[PDB]
């Protein structure tokens, strides 16, 4: 079982207290733990950190699902002839100089991310 790493382990009851949020169809949570044997146990509280998966194509599609026109370029996505979405190695930058669309873009990105 530890050939690749471990695989199937027991989750401790403490995890049930963690702050769960759901990205798409997945549910995510952050925790600090000690790993001993087949047992996974929480020793602490997962820091509050956005985690997710950033794909420029997926975000664009989801934006269009809100009835917004998006343009695809090297720098990211231009929505409604003004929203700027720029992708960084460990994060994303959104530019609010849109007319009343920022909230929509913030929603889309958070559909691919979660505060855990």
């Amino acid at each position: 079982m530890s050939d690749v790493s471990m695989g199937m382990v027991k989750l401790d009851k403490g995890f049930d207290a963690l702050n769960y949020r759901a990205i798409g169809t997945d549910s995510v949570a952050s925790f600090r733990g000690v790993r001993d044997g087949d047992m996974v146990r929480c020793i602490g509280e997962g820091p509050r950190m956005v985690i997710g998966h950033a794909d420029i194509n997926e975000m664009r599609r989801m934006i269009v699902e809100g009835s917004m026109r998006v343009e695809q370029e090297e720098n990211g996505l231009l929505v409604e002839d003004c929203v700027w979405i720029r992708v960084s190695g460990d994060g994303v930058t959104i530019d609010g100089r849109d007319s009343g669309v920022f909230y929509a873009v913030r929603d889309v990105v958070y559909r691919s991310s979660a505060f855990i």
Binding site: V9, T25, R35
Partner: protein, 119 residues
Amino acid sequence: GHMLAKDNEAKIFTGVEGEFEGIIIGTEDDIRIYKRDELIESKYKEMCIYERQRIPYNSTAVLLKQVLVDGFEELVEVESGFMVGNVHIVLSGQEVVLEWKSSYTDDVLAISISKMISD
């Protein structure tokens, strides 16, 4: 629903025993764990989101600091702008550029910033 495994069984492949700080991902099909230190290498990662709001303003930088002080606790003035909490505030002509972090608290105080400059 009810399409999961044992509710106390999960699949974890990174960085195993020894102390580890990890994250749990559960889908309608599968429960899996990654080690946070290892996680940054996976298709899933910690992301810092910078969101910029440009706000029309009729007053001066000194006045902005003054209005911010009215609501705020911690307002720090910096060489190139103002910083409230982890929010970067800079005045640019008759518009203020608000840039702030992904973090829950950072939005909330930033919202307070927005109303200060708004009205």
